[PDB]
Design an enzyme around this catalytic site. Sequence first.
Site, PDB file in Angstrom:
ATOM      1  N   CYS A  18      12.401  32.905 -17.332  1.00 27.21           N
ATOM      2  CA  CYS A  18      12.326  31.486 -17.019  1.00 27.21           C
ATOM      3  C   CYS A  18      11.659  31.339 -15.658  1.00 27.21           C
ATOM      4  CB  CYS A  18      13.726  30.872 -16.982  1.00 27.21           C
ATOM      5  SG  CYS A  18      13.741  29.122 -16.550  1.00 27.21           S
ATOM      6  N   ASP A  53       9.770  30.999 -24.483  1.00 27.41           N
ATOM      7  CA  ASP A  53      10.373  31.681 -23.355  1.00 27.41           C
ATOM      8  C   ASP A  53       9.561  32.925 -22.984  1.00 27.41           C
ATOM      9  OD1 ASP A  53      13.693  33.115 -22.823  1.00 27.41           O
ATOM     10  OD2 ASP A  53      12.076  32.656 -21.415  1.00 27.41           O
TER      11      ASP A  53
HETATM   12  C1  LIG Z   1      12.835  16.819 -17.191  1.00 26.68           C
HETATM   13  C2  LIG Z   1      11.384  16.617 -16.716  1.00 26.68           C
HETATM   14  C3  LIG Z   1      10.830  15.464 -17.456  1.00 26.68           C
HETATM   15  C4  LIG Z   1      11.541  16.298 -15.200  1.00 26.68           C
HETATM   16  O1  LIG Z   1      11.624  14.948 -14.715  1.00 26.68           O
HETATM   17  P1  LIG Z   1      10.897  14.426 -13.379  1.00 26.68           P
HETATM   18  O2  LIG Z   1       9.706  15.420 -12.968  1.00 26.68           O
HETATM   19  O3  LIG Z   1      11.958  14.564 -12.283  1.00 26.68           O
HETATM   20  O4  LIG Z   1      10.132  12.953 -13.369  1.00 26.68           O
HETATM   21  P2  LIG Z   1      10.000  11.875 -14.619  1.00 26.68           P
HETATM   22  O5  LIG Z   1      11.060  12.149 -15.628  1.00 26.68           O
HETATM   23  O6  LIG Z   1       9.917  10.449 -14.091  1.00 26.68           O
HETATM   24  O7  LIG Z   1       8.542  12.282 -15.208  1.00 26.68           O
HETATM   25  C5  LIG Z   1       7.821  13.572 -15.053  1.00 26.68           C
HETATM   26  C6  LIG Z   1       6.253  13.609 -15.160  1.00 26.68           C
HETATM   27  O8  LIG Z   1       6.060  14.391 -16.324  1.00 26.68           O
HETATM   28  C7  LIG Z   1       5.232  13.795 -17.361  1.00 26.68           C
HETATM   29  N1  LIG Z   1       5.638  14.216 -18.731  1.00 26.68           N
HETATM   30  C8  LIG Z   1       6.925  14.463 -19.357  1.00 26.68           C
HETATM   31  N2  LIG Z   1       6.875  14.822 -20.633  1.00 26.68           N
HETATM   32  C9  LIG Z   1       5.508  14.833 -20.920  1.00 26.68           C
HETATM   33  C10 LIG Z   1       4.620  15.130 -22.195  1.00 26.68           C
HETATM   34  N3  LIG Z   1       5.176  15.488 -23.333  1.00 26.68           N
HETATM   35  N4  LIG Z   1       3.014  15.029 -22.145  1.00 26.68           N
HETATM   36  C11 LIG Z   1       2.318  14.639 -20.923  1.00 26.68           C
HETATM   37  N5  LIG Z   1       3.145  14.329 -19.637  1.00 26.68           N
HETATM   38  C12 LIG Z   1       4.678  14.422 -19.714  1.00 26.68           C
HETATM   39  C13 LIG Z   1       5.298  12.269 -17.021  1.00 26.68           C
HETATM   40  O9  LIG Z   1       4.162  11.519 -17.556  1.00 26.68           O
HETATM   41  C14 LIG Z   1       5.458  12.278 -15.439  1.00 26.68           C
HETATM   42  O10 LIG Z   1       4.133  12.373 -14.759  1.00 26.68           O
HETATM   43  P3  LIG Z   1       2.999  11.732 -13.701  1.00 26.68           P
HETATM   44  O11 LIG Z   1       2.632  10.339 -14.270  1.00 26.68           O
HETATM   45  O12 LIG Z   1       3.704  11.674 -12.265  1.00 26.68           O
HETATM   46  O13 LIG Z   1       1.816  12.747 -13.712  1.00 26.68           O
HETATM   47  C15 LIG Z   1      10.471  17.959 -17.071  1.00 26.68           C
HETATM   48  O14 LIG Z   1       9.084  17.798 -16.721  1.00 26.68           O
HETATM   49  C16 LIG Z   1      10.826  19.365 -16.342  1.00 26.68           C
HETATM   50  O15 LIG Z   1      11.436  19.398 -15.222  1.00 26.68           O
HETATM   51  N6  LIG Z   1      10.427  20.519 -17.005  1.00 26.68           N
HETATM   52  C17 LIG Z   1      10.606  21.843 -16.598  1.00 26.68           C
HETATM   53  C18 LIG Z   1      10.388  22.767 -17.779  1.00 26.68           C
HETATM   54  C19 LIG Z   1      11.658  23.644 -18.012  1.00 26.68           C
HETATM   55  O16 LIG Z   1      12.820  23.096 -17.816  1.00 26.68           O
HETATM   56  N7  LIG Z   1      11.330  25.030 -18.441  1.00 26.68           N
HETATM   57  C20 LIG Z   1      12.405  25.935 -18.689  1.00 26.68           C
HETATM   58  C21 LIG Z   1      12.676  25.919 -20.087  1.00 26.68           C
HETATM   59  S1  LIG Z   1      14.368  26.464 -20.416  1.00 26.68           S
HETATM   60  C22 LIG Z   1      14.759  28.166 -20.284  1.00 26.68           C
HETATM   61  O17 LIG Z   1      13.781  28.862 -19.962  1.00 26.68           O
HETATM   62  C23 LIG Z   1      16.131  28.691 -20.551  1.00 26.68           C
HETATM   63  C24 LIG Z   1      16.225  29.254 -22.001  1.00 26.68           C
HETATM   64  C25 LIG Z   1      16.053  28.164 -23.003  1.00 26.68           C
HETATM   65  O18 LIG Z   1      15.219  30.142 -22.180  1.00 26.68           O
HETATM   66  C26 LIG Z   1      17.614  29.956 -22.302  1.00 26.68           C
HETATM   67  C27 LIG Z   1      18.252  30.598 -21.176  1.00 26.68           C
HETATM   68  O19 LIG Z   1      17.706  31.686 -20.622  1.00 26.68           O
HETATM   69  O20 LIG Z   1      19.324  30.139 -20.719  1.00 26.68           O
HETATM   70 MG   LIG Z   2      15.683  32.552 -21.687  1.00 27.51          MG
END
Ligand SMILES: CC(C)(COP(=O)([O-])OP(=O)([O-])OC[C@H]1O[C@@H](n2cnc3c(N)ncnc32)[C@H](O)[C@@H]1OP(=O)([O-])[O-])[C@@H](O)C(=O)NCCC(=O)NCCSC(=O)C[C@@](C)(O)CC(=O)[O-]
Ligand SMILES: [Mg+2]
Lengths: 296, 296
Positions: B239, B15
Site C-alpha cells: 500500500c 494492490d
Molecule cells: C477518499 C478520497 C476521495 C479523498 O478525499 P479528498 O482528497 O480529501 O477530497 P474530495 O473528497 O473533496 O475530492 C478529491 C479529488 O479527487 C477527485 N476524484 C475522486 N474520485 C475520482 C474519479 N473516479 N475520477 C476523476 N477524479 C476523482 C475529485 O474530482 C477531487 O479533485 P480536484 O477537482 O481537486 O482535482 C480518495 O482520493 C483517496 O484519498 N484515495 C487514496 C487511494 C487509497 O486509499 N489507496 C489505498 C487502497 S487500500 C489498501 O491498499 C489496503 C488493502 C485493501 O490492500 C488491504 C489491506 O492491506 O489492509
Molecule cells: Mg493490501
Amino acid sequence: TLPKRVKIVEVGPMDGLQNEKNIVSTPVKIKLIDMLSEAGLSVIETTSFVSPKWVPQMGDHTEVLKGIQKFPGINYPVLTPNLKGFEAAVAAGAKEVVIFGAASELFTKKNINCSIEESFQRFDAILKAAQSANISVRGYVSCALGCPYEGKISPAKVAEVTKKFYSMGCYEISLGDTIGVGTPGIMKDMLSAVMQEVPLAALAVHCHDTYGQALANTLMALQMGVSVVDSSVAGLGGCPYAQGASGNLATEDLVYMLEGLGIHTGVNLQKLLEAGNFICQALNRKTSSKVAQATC
Amino acid sequence: TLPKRVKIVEVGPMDGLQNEKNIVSTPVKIKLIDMLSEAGLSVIETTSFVSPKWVPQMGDHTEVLKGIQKFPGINYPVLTPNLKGFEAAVAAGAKEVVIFGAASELFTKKNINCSIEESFQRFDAILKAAQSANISVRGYVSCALGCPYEGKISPAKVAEVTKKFYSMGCYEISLGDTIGVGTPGIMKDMLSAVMQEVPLAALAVHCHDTYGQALANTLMALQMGVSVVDSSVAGLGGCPYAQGASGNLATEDLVYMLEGLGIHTGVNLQKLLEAGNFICQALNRKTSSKVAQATC
Ligand SMILES: CC(C)(COP(=O)([O-])OP(=O)([O-])OC[C@H]1O[C@@H](n2cnc3c(N)ncnc32)[C@H](O)[C@@H]1OP(=O)([O-])[O-])[C@@H](O)C(=O)NCCC(=O)NCCSC(=O)C[C@@](C)(O)CC(=O)[O-]
Ligand SMILES: [Mg+2]
C-alpha cells in the site's frame, strides 16, 4: 499447544555455507560463528570434517573448530560422515557430532550404493567410539517430507529410521525437508508417526523454504510439540536436488515469529541480523531473510 | 478445523500494481487480468476508482474494468472510496465494489484522508446505493494486526469495525495485515474477537509478507475456520500509504500449500505462474513467488 521454549539450531556456517556457490575465507567463517554466539544461539553447527576431495567449502574444518571462541554453555556440533572424519573431529576438540541418513531407499542408494538398513552400519563404529569418548551424536533424516527420487515418503518409514537413529544412541534426531516440498498436513502426519516411537524432546525439524513452506511447516511442528528447530542465519544454503529457489529457513524470520508468539529463544535479533549482514556481504549475495530486508 | 475449500481473492492487479513507481500500461493491466481469469481464480480485484492524484497507477480504472474479459463465474471487484468513485464504478459496469477502512485512526487519516466515523458515513452511502441494484459490497479493515503509525491495535477494536461493516451490508470483510508485522498468536487473537461479532463465512484474511509471516499467519486463519484469503501473483504489492509496505503473500505459494493440504481452489498453478511471469517481465522485476523460482 505451543512449547514455552524453543532451541534454535543454527546451521548457517555448516549446511548454509556448504551449499553456497562462493566460498569464504577461514577468518570470515570464524567471525560469522563468533557473531552467532554473541547473538545468543545455544547451538551452532560449525563445520563438517569431510574429505575436501568431495566438498571444498568445508575444507577448513579443523582450523575453524579450533579458531572459534567457545562461549559458556554454547554447543558447536560438527558433521562426521565417516569414522575417519569422526576421528579428525575428536582430535580437533569436537564435543558433539552429527550423523545422517534418509527415509528414502532411492536417495540412499544413489548416494552410497546401499539400502537404508546398510547405511546404518557406517555409524556403528562412530556411535560406539563417541560413547567411549563421552561425545554426543545428533541424528539427521532427510526426505522426511518427500524425496526428489521416490516422491511421497511414508510417515511410518520416517518413524522407523528415526527410531533406529534414536536407539543406536542419537540423543536427538532432526527431520529434514531439504527439497522443501512439504506442506502442513505432510509435516503433521510425519511427526504424528515419529512421536509414537520416539520421545518428543528428542525431535527437531529442518525445513527448507524452496517452495515458501518452511515457516508454515515449522509452526505445524511447533503445534505438535516439537521444541527444537533448525534454520540458517540469512536463509543461506540450498539443495543440490532442487531448482533456483532458496534453501534454509531464515533464522531471523523464525526468531521474529517466535518472539511474536512469546516463545523464549534467548537470541538477540538485532545481533543475529548483524551476523546475517556480515556473512552476506562476504558472500556477495542478498539476504533471504524478509525480516532483514525490511529492517534495513 | 481446516475448510475443504478456500476462495482465493487475487489482488495482484490492484494492490499488487498500486505501489509501483513505473506505471504499467492499460493493455498490460488488461492482459494480466485476463491471464488471471485464465488461471481459474474465482475473484480478481480489478482496479480502484480512486483519485489519480493519490494513486495514479490506478488512474485508468474506467477503461481497465471495461476492457477485461468477463469470464463466466469469475467476479471482478473494484475499490470505491466514496459515492463519487462508486458512481464511476457502476457506470463502468461493476457488479461488486469494495469499501476500505482501518482499525487505526491515523492510517485512516493518511490513507483515505478522514476519521473512522467519517468513513462509516461515506460507506453507508455506498451500501445504500448498492443494495438497490443487488451490487454486492466487500469491506476491508487495514491494520488488523497493527498500524505503522499507532503500533499495537486491539482485537476488540478490529472486531468493532468489522461488526460495523457487516451490520451495514458488507457480505464479506477482509482483515488486512497491511504492514505484515503479525505473528500467529496476534492473528488468532484478532480472529477470535472478530468471530464473536461476525459470522465466519463473511470473513477473509489479507496478509502481507514483509516479515515472512504471511503464509504462517494465513495458515492460522485457515485453522480458525476462515475460508477466503487474499494474495498477489508473483508476490507483488504494497500500500503506497502504509509506509514500508512490502508485497502480498504470493498466490502461487498459497495454492501450493492448499493443494498440498488437499484443499480445493480451482486454480491452475501452471497458468497462474505464466500470468506471474508475464506481469514480472512487464515490470522488469524478479518474481517473489518461491514456487515460481523452484519451477524454472
Ligand atoms: C477518499 C478520497 C476521495 C479523498 O478525499 P479528498 O482528497 O480529501 O477530497 P474530495 O473528497 O473533496 O475530492 C478529491 C479529488 O479527487 C477527485 N476524484 C475522486 N474520485 C475520482 C474519479 N473516479 N475520477 C476523476 N477524479 C476523482 C475529485 O474530482 C477531487 O479533485 P480536484 O477537482 O481537486 O482535482 C480518495 O482520493 C483517496 O484519498 N484515495 C487514496 C487511494 C487509497 O486509499 N489507496 C489505498 C487502497 S487500500 C489498501 O491498499 C489496503 C488493502 C485493501 O490492500 C488491504 C489491506 O492491506 O489492509
Ligand atoms: Mg493490501
